[PDB]
Amino acid sequence: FGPQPISRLEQCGINANDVKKLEEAGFHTVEAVAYAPKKELINIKGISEAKADKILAEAAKLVPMGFTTATEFHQRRSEIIQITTGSKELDKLLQGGIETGSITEMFGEFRTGKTQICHTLAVTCQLPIDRGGGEGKAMYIDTEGTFRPERLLAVAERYGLSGSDVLDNVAYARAFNTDHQTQLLYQASAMMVESRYALLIVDSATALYRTDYSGRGELSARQMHLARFLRMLLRLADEFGVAVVITNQVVAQVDPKKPIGGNIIAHASTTRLYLRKGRGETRICKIYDSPCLPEAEAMFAINADGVGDAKD
Amino acid sequence: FGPQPISRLEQCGINANDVKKLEEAGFHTVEAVAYAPKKELINIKGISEAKADKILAEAAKLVPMGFTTATEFHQRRSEIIQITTGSKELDKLLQGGIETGSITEMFGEFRTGKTQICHTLAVTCQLPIDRGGGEGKAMYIDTEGTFRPERLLAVAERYGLSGSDVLDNVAYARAFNTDHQTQLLYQASAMMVESRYALLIVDSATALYRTDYSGRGELSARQMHLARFLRMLLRLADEFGVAVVITNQVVAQVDPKKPIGGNIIAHASTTRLYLRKGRGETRICKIYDSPCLPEAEAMFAINADGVGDAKD
Amino acid sequence: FGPQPISRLEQCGINANDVKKLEEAGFHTVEAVAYAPKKELINIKGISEAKADKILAEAAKLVPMGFTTATEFHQRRSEIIQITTGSKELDKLLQGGIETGSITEMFGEFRTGKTQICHTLAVTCQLPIDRGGGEGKAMYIDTEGTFRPERLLAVAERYGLSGSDVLDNVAYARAFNTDHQTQLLYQASAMMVESRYALLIVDSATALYRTDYSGRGELSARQMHLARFLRMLLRLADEFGVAVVITNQVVAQVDPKKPIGGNIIAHASTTRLYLRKGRGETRICKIYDSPCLPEAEAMFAINADGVGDAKD
């Protein structure tokens, strides 16, 4: 119950114009109103002197304390609920599972079923707190259309959940245009408002971008636009405190495997887990740096009833 | 009857310029108009402020719902009609046949008659819904010119269909230039508009590319151009919801068999089935990962009257 | 005990208005009152004739001597207490550690754990003068939220300090808006007044700026605003004489690795150490020019209990 009910603010010019400001593309949550810069406050059809101060001062979501709260975060950070891999080995290498309030990626190759791996968690997300789940509704928002509800139905059987219930609990977009990607997120923001939505697979986030822009070296701007989309996801992170696990594509360096797709503005915070497919049905997935464990490795195999333990 | 009749939109500036926008290289289907990014909307001689908003807003093909429709896809995906191999074994390994609305490939070697195997389905495509067919007219658009209508005529006899009718139902291009490949697709788009065309063998799609470009290491750009062509095929996928089965060439790794021809931008979604020719007349064809079955194998032999069952 | 107790000035119009002038956004320390330009003195709601003269003349913090004190600085500069790296090698390359009364930066790539490296010192800062510490409370004020108190707790074990005490000693902000960055600093200024706060990791200082402004070439002004923020940090430097270590992001030059993020107005004063990650767990960090040693290099590896020595 993170959000301070969108425009919880009673006043500070809450009369129609401010409500229209929220009713605009502008994010509606308390956090959004508060987090925003003045550029953005004066971005769209509101009176800059009065509005900014009023809105900014008014929220006092604190926000202000900022550099306050020395090792109080330790009392908090501990409380952050960390999701469940479904390989015992996987979870050990994750050291507490894939985590909410971080944008966490996977550096996959071809054939490596990272598509497959991601779709699986989107089921565990549904499970109770004590069974390693987030007891929330769930975003997989796919740009390849790598989406098989059929495979997800198998996961239900494995983890003892009512099929039709589980499928109804998480919801999905094919969204082709590079601009559409940006667009989609804003309405998620709206969708996030209405109930507790828990964990999110944009998949792959890079893939719609790979092509359909990147005509050689008019790329300065490509990488600019990704930023915007990437910052928004971090905005989405703070707002609702939802897990964002975003899928990448490695693209060869021919001077093997490769760097994760499109390089530099994939920023430090987004914690990144790379999958490298191996002997027989087994596949191996070895965390590149996050803060977690400074590094580490570990295999596992995809199983008809979900990505699981190295057992045959 | 997927397409919303090209420019179904009555207005939103439909006056001559918009019609000329569609009458341009720009795709004409409702989906095309809607799917496109603004880069592309502002790609060619239209006024960016007015046009984009008008066209984009107007379509409302929804499009917008995107992350909506939680396990509603299950009600839909089920309805997707999945084509017929003609080896009972083949179909069992396919677990419902080669599927429409996906770009599905085959990783063939030399002598492996994958050329042959592909031409066969292009007949079953013609068959009624209940006999495993798609009741659609059909694209084989070959760059090797590996095209024998004679062999296809044999398939008719096997599957009890009127010869001259069947041959008239599917149609073919030799198209030599790497640029011609891209070009050809756009007019298909036009050809797709005019009637229900069902399943498509571009064959081999890589082969015209293999040479006639790839002068060593000015390949960054080779792999770029393939992308464009590959994205367009996925665009063609959404548009008409037609099966795209694209044929590859294996190319040795001398460090056996081999990786499918030109590597990385062959993307996860395109589901890939590899053929490996074997004892006597028999040949074996063992699905590399798609979502279908996480993996699995199975032989079969080419028979004078089509690719068939392992029976002698 | 650098600060002359904010408004140490007994008179010089200290009656209510001057106190309100200090009680304003305007910095409160003796140094702030003194250092300020008249533009800024006449910036906010004071009488320009009387106020300026009174305040300016009154401080006489000397200030005035300026070009005085020929190599007396040598008697002083020597006394400046210089913090402790925790790699013996690191400290040798630093030639006395990361230094207070300078804004010192680190030019990091992805995966290079500079995030990690910075969080570590924020512990040594706590240590006694003789053990290489600053015996002060500490600012890490993070914009990525790259903050793991958990990892910091490990540092305590390594350097034999009471866990809960150490964590209570240093304090942290996630602060998203580009304008918020500027805002946060002013209250630090207030927080700096109240006790001896010793060393400061703004982290990364560039990263909130990377995006969320820099829409192409309305950038002249971006770089202006950074200046302001950067000058304030130098203002903060003189005031309390506290170490400012600010983390950067390298941003590729595609005409490798890269220039530090956002170019020109990163000024000469900020002494800069760039980290370049290497063989296995090891990482190498090779001082770009400051005055220190005109250049030089040196590796080291991250160790579960802190960034440390080349030992296995």
From Swiss-Prot, chains A, B, C:
What's in the GO CC field?
centrosome; chromatin; chromosome, telomeric region; condensed chromosome; condensed nuclear chromosome; cytoplasm; cytosol; lateral element
Q: A Pfam family for this UniProt protein?
A: Rad51
CDD domains recorded: Rad51
Motif extent (Nuclear export signal)? 226-241
Q: Where Phosphotyrosine occurs, residue numbers?
A: Y35
UniProt modified residues of type Phosphothreonine: T282
List the protein's name: DNA repair protein RAD51 homolog 1
Question: What organism does the record attribute this protein to?
Answer: Homo sapiens
